[PDB]
Design an enzyme around this catalytic site. Structure first.
Site, mmCIF file in Angstrom:
data_model
loop_
_atom_site.group_PDB
_atom_site.id
_atom_site.type_symbol
_atom_site.label_atom_id
_atom_site.label_comp_id
_atom_site.label_asym_id
_atom_site.label_seq_id
_atom_site.Cartn_x
_atom_site.Cartn_y
_atom_site.Cartn_z
ATOM 1 N N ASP A 126 -9.043 -7.211 -28.138
ATOM 2 C CA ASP A 126 -7.843 -6.822 -28.802
ATOM 3 C C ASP A 126 -7.201 -7.716 -29.960
ATOM 4 O O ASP A 126 -7.484 -8.969 -29.990
ATOM 5 C CB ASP A 126 -6.289 -6.875 -27.709
ATOM 6 C CG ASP A 126 -4.985 -6.675 -28.218
ATOM 7 O OD1 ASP A 126 -4.839 -5.609 -28.680
ATOM 8 O OD2 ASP A 126 -4.447 -7.684 -28.343
ATOM 9 N N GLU A 177 -10.924 -3.991 -31.454
ATOM 10 C CA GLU A 177 -10.347 -3.025 -31.779
ATOM 11 C C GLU A 177 -10.177 -3.140 -33.606
ATOM 12 O O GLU A 177 -9.227 -3.987 -33.848
ATOM 13 C CB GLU A 177 -8.920 -2.818 -31.312
ATOM 14 C CG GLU A 177 -7.973 -1.811 -31.827
ATOM 15 C CD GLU A 177 -6.500 -1.839 -31.045
ATOM 16 O OE1 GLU A 177 -5.815 -2.948 -31.319
ATOM 17 O OE2 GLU A 177 -6.150 -0.902 -30.423
#
Lengths: 598, 598
Positions: A330, A367
């Site tokens: 993330d 991501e």
């Protein structure tokens, strides 16, 4: 003049310690010489190519070169330099170039391939744990950062914009285990979970404990059961790795003083330098969210804690008893030192390196809503959520929108130029494991973004399984849940079949079966063959097999396909869609996507 | 629709901790909204732009945005997103893009700029020491690796293909000191020397001692005198850094057993792991040359020796008494671990980092015949010998050849697309210090490569001083020596004025004076304004000043210049060449290059 080459058989072949490269040419004024420009330890080589005696197809001449594999780095970059008496021409992943192409945009093949070779064989499924499935054998508290108590909701209660990060519908990890028959029926072979570690919120990116599973999701035992259950079904399992920042309720920070010694209120805290504080003591955070204080990777003890040591967080969940299959990173792009992204690539590479040390086939991918190419071309991560290379091209071509939900009017030319340009910076083994999706917990549902053009949704589904890369289904997409961005993209899964789009579910089932049946959809190269206005036609190529995909976003039309040596087959067997191919003529119904085998 | 922007004033302005960005637009259907897409810590921001009330030029609308400089990394990447009600458009260094551009190919400006800001103010001169100048107050030996004795030659003896690396004409460093009046007359403000360290050959890349100057070149005292003399004249001095490999006569290797303990013949040598040996003991080398054994940077003690420690080679020559101004890195792209280029970027970055530690304004740039963009975009070096971005585009456009001396037929469109595409990957401060040259000790003389088109040579000279970057003169080019590649590109300098092209020398003198006089040729942005067939027209832009360059490689012709807000000036003053501009019409004589001021 025409040319064909793809970084896969039938165009490349490995014999002994050599990589044979074959180029196809056709035209009236062919070059008498062709150079195979291959790169060895960053030195550009001029490898001579020789004409093959046998024509691989009518009207086509074949040239062949060798790449010596005993020397040089694993990634084998190369391109073709056509030589006339008075001029030259380059053939690249982006067709012909009159001036030399970028070194990082040539053809590339990883020999030997040390990447996670299992990723290409997968069909992923993303689960926001609280909103998926309540377990059969299933409590409020104060959310300090939110200012109010958490609110429990019944599974059929509509999802409102209030208390987005504190509304719980009760889904847990055992509910995922109980629904594995459904996911296996769908074709899913791998699961990616949103954060499941101890955290006050419902999304749980505000990590409070990197070493325990949140009890609301079932605790440690529920995750360990899910790991055993996924192993039994031969299903891979990826956990969400939140390392750019912690939660402000974590012991290292502890803004709410749930214990003592936290860095937020103690200058002599052992973790005071794991965060960045102002001279007046306000902590740096992620995009203004005080609940997500940013970790400062200048600290050599934080590095040891996250990925440096044997007992680090990154490696802790990749060994027994957990033995997860890798990390989805993330905010991979902002992780760094000093409140920003300084030395971002160095720490991301170190995170991935620590992962492979505990688990050589661990899968680490981040991501990237933006351009991930610099990360991927430096091998700091195995893959990336392919928003720039797949998602946003489809948002524009099909849904007339983009990342910022600004209007988009792009045709088939611009879309495939966009898509082919991005792949050009990646080796073939990299393209095959790019993490492709249509939406996620961080976007509006793609079904919603289509607006009045919902009828195009099946086309994106067929596309999701046929473009190079591994497909990931955001939970509920297969049964047709819609809704706008956070908090409305995280609706509870509709298990009532009357609330399910059964036709959309069957299409997902058929596409995964086609991908499991045909190697070209998992290992094959990709040549865009037609891209004009409303129609896109590309082909996957592996050995002697071909898979033809024809997508038409607009009214019904016919498209004549020029004769191509890539399309010279015994015949085509329609496997999906209502299209028809006959004598190089493509009869495409309106808003259609069709797939052909053989 | 038309647009203009350059990463320099008048388009950018720094006030307080903000960077103001201004975009110019013109057309019939202008966008009602424009987004300044700026990147902060790798997160893409959507900064709103507002229309300025005052038109900067007739028919032109101006939009303005701000970039907050207090946060984020020094390199400020940004591009423009034009927004209509139904579509969008990108404006980039490469004009308009219908799909989002590469993150590394936007506009970029380094604020704050920690690079060597003095490089932009320089005019470089490369000296192959043995072939430049014998000192006023000026001996054979056996060259082991060559197999024969070295041969001494008289200064006027023709240069033959025999014993290329063992033929000495006797030039030394004191001869450089004695010719400083000539070099200063030419406009030279900085010197780059080929290797001058103790080595048996004449080029001396077969380094035998990284800590002493070869006595044939005058020894330590001659270099120390040259450093003092260059300092007195305010001239910068760069030494050639050969770190990918050593000479096989070096003590660390010692193939010829001139002492004891060398790695070549002693398995227990202290430097045995500073090289890579086969199981049978043959050492890895640079491209098959046994005299250049490749250094293995996996050794932590070699790293400490080359750049790691305070007493390392890289830092030794950047402090007193030597205090050189930086390093030109030989074979920068292959330096690495394990006989190849593994971790090349990490060690190149470490070399540069060690250089700045001893000398914060040290200038480190490597020899890149290929695509250097991955090195430069990672800031592992300050600059690169710009063969891909400048030299080889000119070899093709002007001399119809390329790096491999293969035929080349490219027009003005392909050349400037080639040249503009390369710059697009670099910040403006990077473009201003790119090391531009026409030839070197490792290429054929550019005058030779022109063949029957020698008349174009002045055009490349004007181009060398007007394109973004710092110019470097290969010794003798200014007086017109020619010859093919090694060994014939290293002819002795003709000091006899009857053997000198005086007109070519004066052109070099005038161009450096123009560059010294006008800031735009040292700090200004660059907009290609016309690039069709035989004619190239670009302009340098700094504040309110403009420098117009018009190059015509072919027959005499006229070219009409569309009205541009970049060209709206009081008037143009011809400073060089025989061109003429009147009412937007360019009258260009055949084979001409013209420059205009104001």
């Amino acid at each position: 003049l025409k040319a064909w080459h793809l970084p896969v058989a039938p165009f490349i072949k490995e014999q002994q310690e050599r990589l044979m490269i074959t180029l196809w040419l056709s035209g009236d004024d062919l070059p008498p010489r062709v150079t195979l420009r291959a790169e060895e330890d960053n030195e550009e080589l001029s490898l001579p190519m020789h004409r093959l005696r046998q024509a691989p197809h009518p009207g086509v001449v074949a040239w062949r070169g060798e790449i010596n594999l005993v020397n040089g780095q694993p990634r084998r970059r190369y391109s073709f330099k056509l030589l006339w008496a008075d001029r030259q021409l380059w053939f690249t992943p982006q067709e012909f170039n009159r001036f030399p192409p970028a070194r990082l945009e040539q053809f590339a093949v990883d020999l030997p391939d040390s990447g996670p070779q299992w990723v290409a064989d997968q069909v992923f499924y993303q689960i926001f744990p609280d909103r998926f499935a309540r377990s059969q054998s299933r409590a409020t508290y104060y959310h300090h950062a939110a200012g109010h108590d958490i609110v429990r909701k019944a599974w059929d209660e509509p999802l409102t914009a209030e208390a987005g990060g504190s509304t719980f519908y009760g889904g847990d990890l055992d509910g995922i285990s109980e629904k594995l028959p459904y996911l296996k029926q769908l074709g899913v072979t791998a699961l990616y979970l949103n954060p499941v570690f101890v955290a006050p919120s419902v999304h749980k990116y505000d990590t409070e404990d990197y070493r325990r599973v949140d009890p609301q999701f079932g605790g440690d035992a529920a995750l360990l059961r899910l790991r055993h259950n996924t192993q039994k079904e031969g299903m891979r399992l990826i956990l969400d790795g939140v390392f750019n920042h912690s939660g402000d309720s974590h012991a290292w920070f502890d803004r709410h003083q749930r214990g003592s010694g936290g860095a937020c209120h103690n200058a002599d805290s052992p973790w005071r330098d794991w965060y960045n504080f102002s001279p007046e003591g306000v902590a740096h955070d992620w995009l203004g969210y005080a609940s997500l204080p940013k970790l400062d990777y200048r600290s050599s003890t934080l590095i040891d804690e996250i990925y440096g040591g044997e007992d680090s967080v990154v490696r802790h969940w990749l060994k027994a008893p957990w033995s997860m299959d890798g990390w989805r990173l993330d905010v991979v792009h902002m992780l760094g030192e000093g409140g920003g992204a300084r030395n971002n690539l160095r720490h991301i590479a170190g995170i991935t390196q620590a992962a492979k040390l505990e688990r050589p086939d661990a899968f680490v991918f981040g991501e990237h809503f933006g351009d991930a190419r610099q990360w991927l071309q430096a091998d700091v991560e195995d893959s990336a959520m392919n928003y720039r290379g797949f998602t946003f091209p489809l948002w524009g071509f099909l849904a007339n929108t983009d990342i910022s939900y600004d209007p988009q009017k792009i045709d088939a030319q611009t879309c495939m130029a966009w898509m082919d340009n991005y792949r050009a910076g990646l080796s073939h083994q990299q393209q095959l494991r790019m993490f492709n999706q249509l939406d996620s917990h961080a976007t509006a549902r793609f079904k919603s973004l289509l607006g009045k053009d919902v009828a195009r949704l099946p086309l994106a589904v067929v596309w999701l399984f046929s473009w190079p890369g591994v497909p990931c289904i955001y939970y509920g997409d297969e049964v047709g849940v819609d809704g706008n961005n956070d908090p409305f993209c995280r609706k509870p899964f509709p298990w009532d079949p009357a609330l399910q789009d059964g036709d959309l579910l069957d299409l997902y089932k058929r596409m995964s079966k086609l991908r499991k049946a045909h190697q070209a959809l998992r290992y094959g190269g990709c040549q865009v063959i037609y891209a004009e206005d409303n129609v896109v036609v590309f082909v996957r190529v592996y050995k002697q097999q071909r898979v033809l995909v024809a997508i038409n976003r607009g009214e019904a039309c016919e498209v004549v396909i020029e004769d191509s040596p890539l399309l010279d087959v015994n015949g085509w067997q329609l496997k999906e869609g209502a299209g028809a191919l006959h004598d190089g003529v493509l009869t495409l119904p309106a808003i259609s996507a069709s797939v052909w085998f053989s």
